Design a protein around this ligand. Structure first.
Ligand SMILES: Nc1ncnc2c1ncn2[C@@H]1O[C@H](COP(=O)(O)OP(=O)(O)O)[C@@H](O)[C@H]1O
Ligand SMILES: [Mg+2]
Length: 289
């Protein structure tokens, strides 16, 4: 598991009331929390000026190399409410986040390799709220987690989609985000965007049985002081396995387990009003390595 940290910039109000900053980014790998004057080291640290592109380049852009080699991949956006999880994963109208950037790059990579491999993909978007799985793109009752013969986790009843263009990708993700359980969006909504890749050699037959590769991009529930969130942590400690303890971890039974390429983007607010939130998130992220 790769672990990176994203420090968001303070908002207009926070700056006016200019309280002391609780996080100081030294360089690409090192930050300082706070006294306690704690030095943390991470695979990557993105400061207040980081663009979506920089985050993408150091997160899913490399992991896509693994995805196109048939490895399941997982990206977990973790941290307290207001820290940046959604801006990072979904983004805004001006700055599309990691889900969109990932999808465009995937489409570009599939086009580039068409002389070596035959590809097709689909995506789904679901929520876990209160141990209930809801399809975010079609109004349906809660769904259950099953397993195929090859120990692929399936969500029976989840709809699959094929947005071809930039705008369809944006529209799908926006619709999905608006159907998350409301509070603004509930702080306890986990949102799980998944991409399914079928890939085969040029010379294989068109119905060769091929394992579907899965990338999960996950905007987690807020960690501010929820069986799913804590179960996630039980699994993460463990690894460094209680997958069954929760709906979320059951979901990821095939997507965290050794083999998979996984990354955590710990989002943190730098303001001293979020001292405790940030301290806990930083300790959690430090645990995940
Ligand atoms: N790095 C960023 N750059 C600019 N604004 C950000 C950034 N990260 C978060 N924000 C802003 O702070 C806010 C809270 O971010 P959000 O992603 O919704 O938090 P979370 O999903 O972790 O609860 C939003 O208004 C968002 O636009
Ligand atoms: Mg959010």
């Amino acid at each position: 598991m790769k672990v990176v940290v994203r420090v968001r910039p303070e908002n207009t109000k926070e700056k006016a009331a200019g309280f002391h900053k609780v996080v100081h980014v030294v360089d690409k790998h090192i930050l300082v929390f706070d006294n306690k004057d704690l030095k943390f080291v991470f695979d990557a640290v993105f400061d207040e000026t980081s663009t979506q592109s920089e985050v993408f380049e150091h997160t899913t852009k490399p992991i896509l190399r693994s995805f196109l080699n048939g490895y399941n991949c997982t990206v977990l956006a973790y941290g307290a409410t207001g820290a940046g999880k959604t801006h990072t994963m979904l983004g805004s109208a001006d700055e599309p986040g990691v889900m969109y950037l990932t999808m465009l790059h995937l489409y570009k990579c599939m086009d580039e390799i068409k002389e070596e491999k035959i590809c097709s993909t689909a995506v789904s978007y679901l929520e876990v709220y209160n141990e209930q799985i809801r399809d975010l793109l079609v109004n349906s009752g809660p769904l259950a987690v099953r397993e195929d013969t090859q120990k692929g986790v399936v969500v029976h009843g989840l709809t699959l989609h094929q947005p071809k263009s930039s705008e369809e990708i944006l529209h799908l993700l926006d619709n999905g985000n608006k159907n998350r359980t409301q509070h603004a969006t509930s702080s306890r909504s986990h949102a799980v965007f998944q991409i399914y890749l079928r890939q085969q050699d040029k010379t294989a037959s068109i119905n060769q049985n091929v394992r579907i590769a899965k990338m999960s991009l996950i905007d987690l529930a807020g960690s501010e002081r929820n069986r799913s969130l804590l179960a996630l942590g039980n699994v993460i400690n463990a690894l460094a396995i209680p997958y069954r303890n929760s709906k979320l971890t059951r979901l990821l039974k095939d997507s965290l387990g050794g083999n998979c390429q996984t990354i955590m983007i710990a989002a943190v607010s730098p303001s001293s009003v979020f001292y405790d939130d940030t301290y806990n998130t930083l300790k959690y992220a430090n645990r995940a390595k």
